[PDB]
Amino acid sequence: MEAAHSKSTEECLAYFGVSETTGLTPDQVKRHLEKYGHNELPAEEGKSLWELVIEQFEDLLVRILLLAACISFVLAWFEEGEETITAFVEPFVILLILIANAIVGVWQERNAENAIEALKEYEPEMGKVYRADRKSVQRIKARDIVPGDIVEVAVGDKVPADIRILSIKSTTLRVDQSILTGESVSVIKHTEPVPDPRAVNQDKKNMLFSGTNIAAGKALGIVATTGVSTEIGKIRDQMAATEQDKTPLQQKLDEFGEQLSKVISLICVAVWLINIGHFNDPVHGGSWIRGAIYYFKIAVALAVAAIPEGLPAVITTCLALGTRRMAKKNAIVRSLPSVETLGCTSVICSDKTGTLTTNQMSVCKMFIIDKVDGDFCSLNEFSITGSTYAPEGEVLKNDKPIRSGQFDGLVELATICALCNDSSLDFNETKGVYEKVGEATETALTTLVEKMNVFNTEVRNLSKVERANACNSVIRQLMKKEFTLEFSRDRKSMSVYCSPAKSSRAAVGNKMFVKGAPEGVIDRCNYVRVGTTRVPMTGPVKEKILSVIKEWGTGRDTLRCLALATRDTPPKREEMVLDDSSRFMEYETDLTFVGVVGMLDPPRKEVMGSIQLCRDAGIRVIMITGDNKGTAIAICRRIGIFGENEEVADRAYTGREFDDLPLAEQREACRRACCFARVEPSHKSKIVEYLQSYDEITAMTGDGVNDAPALKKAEIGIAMGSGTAVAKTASEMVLADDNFSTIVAAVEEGRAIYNNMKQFIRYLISSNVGEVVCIFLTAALGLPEALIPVQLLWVNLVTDGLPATALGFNPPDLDIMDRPPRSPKEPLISGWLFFRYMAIGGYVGAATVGAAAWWFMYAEDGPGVTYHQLTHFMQCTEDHPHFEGLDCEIFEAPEPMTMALSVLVTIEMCNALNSLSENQSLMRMPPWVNIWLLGSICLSMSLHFLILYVDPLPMIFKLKALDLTQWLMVLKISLPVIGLDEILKFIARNYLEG
Ligand SMILES: C/C=C(/C)C(=O)O[C@H]1C(C)=C2[C@H]([C@@H]1OC(=O)CCCCCCC)[C@@](C)(OC(C)=O)C[C@H](OC(=O)CCC)[C@@]1(O)[C@H]2OC(=O)[C@@]1(C)O
Numbered sequence: 001m002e003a004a005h006s007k008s009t010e011e012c013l014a015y016f017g018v019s020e021t022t023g024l025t026p027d028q029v030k031r032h033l034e035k036y037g038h039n040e041l042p043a044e045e046g047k048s049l050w051e052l053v054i055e056q057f058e059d060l061l062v063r064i065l066l067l068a069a070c071i072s073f074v075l076a077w078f079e080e081g082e083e084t085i086t087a088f089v090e091p092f093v094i095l096l097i098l099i100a101n102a103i104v105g106v107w108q109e110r111n112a113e114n115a116i117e118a119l120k121e122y123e124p125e126m127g128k129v130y131r132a133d134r135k136s137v138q139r140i141k142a143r144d145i146v147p148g149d150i151v152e153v154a155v156g157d158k159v160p161a162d163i164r165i166l167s168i169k170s171t172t173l174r175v176d177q178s179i180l181t182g183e184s185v186s187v188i189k190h191t192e193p194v195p196d197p198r199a200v201n202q203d204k205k206n207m208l209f210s211g212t213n214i215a216a217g218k219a220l221g222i223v224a225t226t227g228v229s230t231e232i233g234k235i236r237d238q239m240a241a242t243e244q245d246k247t248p249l250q251q252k253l254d255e256f257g258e259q260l261s262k263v264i265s266l267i268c269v270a271v272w273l274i275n276i277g278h279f280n281d282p283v284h285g286g287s288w289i290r291g292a293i294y295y296f297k298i299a300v301a302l303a304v305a306a307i308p309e310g311l312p313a314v315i316t317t318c319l320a321l322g323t324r325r326m327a328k329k330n331a332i333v334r335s336l337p338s339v340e341t342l343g344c345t346s347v348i349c350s351d352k353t354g355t356l357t358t359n360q361m362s363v364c365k366m367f368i369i370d371k372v373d374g375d376f377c378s379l380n381e382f383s384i385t386g387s388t389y390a391p392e393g394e395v396l397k398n399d400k401p402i403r404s405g406q407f408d409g410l411v412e413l414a415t416i417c418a419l420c421n422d423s424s425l426d427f428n429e430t431k432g433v434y435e436k437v438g439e440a441t442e443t444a445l446t447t448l449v450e451k452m453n454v455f456n457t458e459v460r461n462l463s464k465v466e467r468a469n470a471c472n473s474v475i476r477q478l479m480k481k482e483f484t485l486e487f488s489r490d491r492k493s494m495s496v497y498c499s500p501a502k503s504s505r506a507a508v509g510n511k512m513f514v515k516g517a518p519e520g521v522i523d524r525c526n527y528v529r530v531g532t533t534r535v536p537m538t539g540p541v542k543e544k545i546l547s548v549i550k551e552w553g554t555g556r557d558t559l560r561c562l563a564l565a566t567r568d569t570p571p572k573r574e575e576m577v578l579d580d581s582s583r584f585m586e587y588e589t590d591l592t593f594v595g596v597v598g599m600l601d602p603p604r605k606e607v608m609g610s611i612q613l614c615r616d617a618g619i620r621v622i623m624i625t626g627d628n629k630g631t632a633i634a635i636c637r638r639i640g641i642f643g644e645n646e647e648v649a650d651r652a653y654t655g656r657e658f659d660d661l662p663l664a665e666q667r668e669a670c671r672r673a674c675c676f677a678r679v680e681p682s683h684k685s686k687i688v689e690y691l692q693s694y695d696e697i698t699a700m701t702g703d704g705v706n707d708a709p710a711l712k713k714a715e716i717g718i719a720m721g722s723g724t725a726v727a728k729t730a731s732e733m734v735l736a737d738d739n740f741s742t743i744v745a746a747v748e749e750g751r752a753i754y755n756n757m758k759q760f761i762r763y764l765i766s767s768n769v770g771e772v773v774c775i776f777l778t779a780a781l782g783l784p785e786a787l788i789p790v791q792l793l794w795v796n797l798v799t800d801g802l803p804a805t806a807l808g809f810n811p812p813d814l815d816i817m818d819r820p821p822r823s824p825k826e827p828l829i830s831g832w833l834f835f836r837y838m839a840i841g842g843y844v845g846a847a848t849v850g851a852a853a854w855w856f857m858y859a860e861d862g863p864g865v866t867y868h869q870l871t872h873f874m875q876c877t878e879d880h881p882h883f884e885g886l887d888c889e890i891f892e893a894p895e896p897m898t899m900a901l902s903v904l905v906t907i908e909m910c911n912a913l914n915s916l917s918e919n920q921s922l923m924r925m926p927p928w929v930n931i932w933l934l935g936s937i938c939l940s941m942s943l944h945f946l947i948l949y950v951d952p953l954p955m956i957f958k959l960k961a962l963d964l965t966q967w968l969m970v971l972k973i974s975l976p977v978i979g980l981d982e983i984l985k986f987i988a989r990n991y992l993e994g
């Protein structure tokens, strides 16, 4: 299981000690199969519904909630009185809620899918090998392939493993390594070894990656590595090894629950200490046996009171809606909880070409040599119009149109652009648009020749589906394409060997047309063509050439330049090994510079603006390209990552420079850096790591399995709509339009969603605070139960839910993008706000209790002991004479309850309004600022007037309320809250922190 790409063919055959013509012997197979194991990625482990549900009941609360769902049940039986056949509702409801929860988490999860599973889609079921127990190729199962045996792949096949190529049978071999990088452009493979043992896959020309597809040809190879040890296997490992933290909100709730618990227990502790007098004053009797059940049915109350039962639903329905929302804006957010984190993204690393630019090339300038005489040198710049690959456009000199043909240098420049190009143009009808075909930069070059027919061929008479490849075809018919030497990142260029067609252009017979990066070719040039003639390349002419090269690429034009040359006296055909991409740069020498061309990959409109929004938003933006550092920087300025006259030395690094740094300075570079030039393998991931050490919520883009490990690591991995499937599944969000702007657009929606989300949370949590107080007092004052869990529930699930989810639609602040990203470690409720709900809660806690204790004391329906003795209501049936003289069951009356509850409701529809803004007054932030909020409050109210007047329902708790005096009471009890808040809100002035 090697690094075969650097070893020779005999060396790999040697290593495994196998025969290219025989293959592994069954012994070797078992031996290998044992040592190396099977050729597959570890199985997927998805817990069962049992394992699910269990987890669904691991949340401290859901547990505490369930423990109480029992006590209620245990208490609901030991009732002993038949006239209580509704004692099972309380327990039944709880379990339903609990259940309903698990019902979701189990369905929700089961539908989501990991990327480590998507990877097993690239694993072909079958493979073709050659083993010693037969002469013809045996077609076995990938699973059983082994490191060392001889394999054969061909045109249609999915490469089953990391294979070193032994020999290519077909005249050529092409592979679609797109599932790795995303680009579908097939690549040519060879046999000769690659020296560098630390080489990037991109430069492993003699290797076949498990997962990729044979584009063209047929070849035979020896399996270097299998299973997890394969390029894709490694990635699976990384992605498995990566742990993704919990959304800060889930972090915050998990905390809330932890504490919510500690308090609850403490309350009990205190409650017990409040009634510790039942040790010194109580005597032996049968009365206390009925006091236990009290301390128990008071706990289950204490629970539903504490926990914000409805919250989970409100949230998930909010995020749900925001999702669908963002979707309309092209942001496909997979995984709801991310809508939160998305909103706090500190830094955004975006690939350039796909998203920041349009990836739509077009040549804007060209320049041939005009004259070289002495030290005097003169070029011949031009300008080409037309952004679309459309053949529609004009060449100009100093803005004045020109006939390309009137220049020699140009006709060659054109032929090269036409012959040394593997791309083409096509005109579809489905949308009458001129579409690219091959490589984006070449399909441009072709377009360039259509725009400058060096031969003036008549075309205006041709149809568009012909105007496509006209001027191009003519040049193709003036030279024969013997063959072409492909691009290789070492010599960074390419060429095509050609011969003329008959004696029509037998001028000098065989020619070699080469295109590539300027630096490279220009050195391999010993001559420069001054239009139809040649002169010894010299110092000046060179400086001049390069100078314009820097202006065009570093200047505001920010163009990519391709030097163009031709080898006039190419080596003889037979003297060239056309299958050892090493002697290519060699074959491409003693060249004659004919001209350079410049093209542009136009930034996107919204981009310039989006980049600005981020500045306002305090969100850092980092560009990641393939451009040479020089143009990388230029492009950053052009869009605003940098300022035209800003220093950058320490803010832009090239893939290599970054490596040349020590782990330390490597970390610094990241907090400051805003541009990464020619980034290699790891980098994206390594970069996300550092950004996180500085505790920054970071966004990352990418689209090939090559980027999956980074997309998974980043807080918000961003995949392209046009991206691969593995990328997408590895990401949190997917830009349906690959637009960088769609990213920002989202980050904004995120900040808006959370702000509202943030409030409707405090709203409900604050109520739960008061609810608990009411339950405490009720207990500390011995007073009869002012509120029942069943009621409490309904309140928290419906009467409080509706307005809460309405609050979700609170209008958005106008400076959401003018404030720095929010801090993950920011508490939802603290300091003065803690104090407010501390009070508001206390308010309702008293308010409610008293309204029940009012219907008892000082009321005109059921007058109880106004001397306050009502407190000992437990003592009544037996203690009938001792200070009673009346019916013993008024305490069990319903209206005193419907009171405490009606005040609750109203106070809640009130508090729900004190929520439209954290520190603004309602006279500044009127309640109608959210029509929904109001509309819902109404709906909640009519529902309340439904658990009273309907029939079955009223029995399930309470009775009714006297239109006035009783309802009027409710009002002179609740309404005051608004003032209490407004007053405390007003404290936003007696301290300026509005
Ligand atoms: C739900 C009801 C209650 C009564 C509760 O115990 O909530 C506490 C609690 C656990 C927190 C507190 C509650 O503290 C109290 O209300 C004081 C105790 C009085 C009761 C004693 C009766 C004799 C929150 C509710 O309220 C106020 C206003 O004081 C605010 C906040 O919660 C949030 O930001 C919500 C998190 C989503 C948390 O301080 C939180 O602790 C944390 O870690 C946070 C950051 O979570």
Ligand code: NA
Pocket: 244, 711, 712, 713, 714, 715, 716, 717, 730, 731, 732
């Ligand atoms: Na992620």
